[PDB]
């Protein structure tokens, strides 16, 4: 297989605009949203058909109740931060928890929080400690590190529960998460050389240009991997054609364990 990830984000806004919810929690597997909850609907729902097809209603009922309390937890946490920061107005509290299952079977886990989109606190499941970015975080870290039991529980969930959850979802959406659609790669002229690739999943891809067999990272203008909106992705990389000279340029693409090369005449 490839590497797969399970992530769970929470967003809190102190002064919501009409409609803009004051709590949103969305779950992802790799890049696919699987779950969503917000302060308005106040209920948790799947965002992928294979999530609903495979999870009993009592599951959604149960986690809906949990998220309601977690939404309340988040509201209070954000208040204390704003009080600590002596901040007023609208402010954002965020938290991302998740794990990775690698190709070789090794696992990773992470947990971190952010205030106004700023790295605030980062957990370390290998030292059972928190990393504070400023004094306000350290004050929170002092308290959080007190309940040594919670840190231990954190480690267990990240290392075991998260992976078990992620493995479960991988099978549930096998036909989508574990699929592969190879990219279609073409070369253009614009005057530079555009090596474009479209319609490929998974989204992770590597593209680069070679000068007769030697890469030039500095003089290559890469494009972002954008979503085509049909379930696949697209990306491109350009290079400047030296007019006073003439070399043999070639486009190289790596995607889902396949290496592919195109050569310019």
């Amino acid at each position: 297989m490839r590497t797969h990830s399970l992530r769970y984000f929470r967003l809190g806004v102190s002064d919501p605009i009409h409609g803009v919810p004051e709590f949103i929690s969305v779950g992802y597997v790799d890049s696919h949203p699987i779950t969503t909850y917000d302060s308005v609907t106040r209920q948790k729902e799947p965002r992928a058909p294979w999530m609903a097809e495979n999870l009993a209603p009592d599951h959604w009922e149960r986690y809906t109740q949990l998220l309601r309390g977690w939404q309340q937890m988040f509201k209070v946490e954000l208040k204390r931060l704003q009080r600590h920061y002596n901040h007023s107005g609208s402010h954002t509290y965020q938290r991302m928890i998740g794990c990775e299952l690698l190709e070789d079977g090794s696992t990773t886990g992470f947990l971190q929080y952010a205030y106004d989109g700023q790295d605030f606190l980062i957990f370390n499941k290998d030292t059972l400690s928190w990393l504070a970015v400023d004094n306000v975080a350290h004050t929170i870290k002092q308290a959080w590190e007190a309940n040594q039991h919670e840190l231990l529980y954190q480690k267990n969930w990240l290392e075991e529960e998260c992976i078990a959850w992620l493995k479960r979802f991988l099978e549930y959406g096998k036909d989508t998460l574990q699929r592969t659609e190879p990219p279609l790669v073409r070369v253009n002229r614009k005057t530079a050389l555009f090596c474009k690739a479209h319609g490929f999943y998974p989204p992770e891809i590597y593209m680069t240009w070679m000068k007769n067999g030697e890469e030039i990272v500095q003089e290559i203008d890469y494009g972002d991997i954008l979503p085509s909106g049909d379930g696949t992705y697209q990306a491109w990389a350009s290079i400047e054609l030296d007019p006073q000279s003439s070399n043999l340029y070639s486009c190289h693409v790596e995607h889902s364990g396949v290496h592919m090369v195109l050569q310019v005449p």
Epitope: R62, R68, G69, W70, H149, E150, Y153, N156
Partner: antibody
Framework: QNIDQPTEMTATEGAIVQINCTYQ??????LFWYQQHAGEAPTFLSY??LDGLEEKGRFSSFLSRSKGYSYLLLKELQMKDSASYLC??????????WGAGTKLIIKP | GVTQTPKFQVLKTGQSMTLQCAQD?????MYWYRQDPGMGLRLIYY???????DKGEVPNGYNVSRLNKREFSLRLESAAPSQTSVYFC??????????????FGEGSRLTVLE
Amino acid sequence: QNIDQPTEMTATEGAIVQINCTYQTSGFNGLFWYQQHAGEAPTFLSYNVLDGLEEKGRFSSFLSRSKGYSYLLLKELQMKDSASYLCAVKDSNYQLIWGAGTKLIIKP
Amino acid sequence: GVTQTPKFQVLKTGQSMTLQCAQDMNHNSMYWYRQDPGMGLRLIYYSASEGTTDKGEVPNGYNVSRLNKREFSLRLESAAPSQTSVYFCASSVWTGEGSGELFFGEGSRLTVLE
């Protein structure tokens, strides 16, 4: 989803007793031990979520997540220790599953 | 601590009955349990946070009301002999915590009779 611990255990005053507990749950998020005297409110004793032995005073609690097994260990038993000890496990949905409990009898 | 009333009560089959429970600890989660000989505690209803309640494992014949952050009342709209038990109210700081331990009331003993 079941929790298994003995019904009654009798141990002599001043000795050591080891109350066993085995659990089979969909997920695991910690194992608790509660003390509950006759006609009294249960009270928290110990929490284990990672393997290993945790010691605090006379009481000690051991967890083996792989073996699905745990035990409360009471040292230098006192007459005041006669009570029921409740083994409870949190599952993947944070739902707390209670065992039937173990009634401990201390012979003077 | 956690205060639940009454300690004892006698009920005739078909009566209505309500158990009071309040917690001084500024907790968000509260629970109603029934403890019966032979089997472990069984949750009846639970309030994961203020303004939200859900059924537990045995929610038949019972109902609850999260009056505020402090009170969580349990009702028996019609008493039955199969309801004779000891009812414990508990609270914890939050639900979904790992090490969040429970805090129990003194317990309420009911005996329902024909």
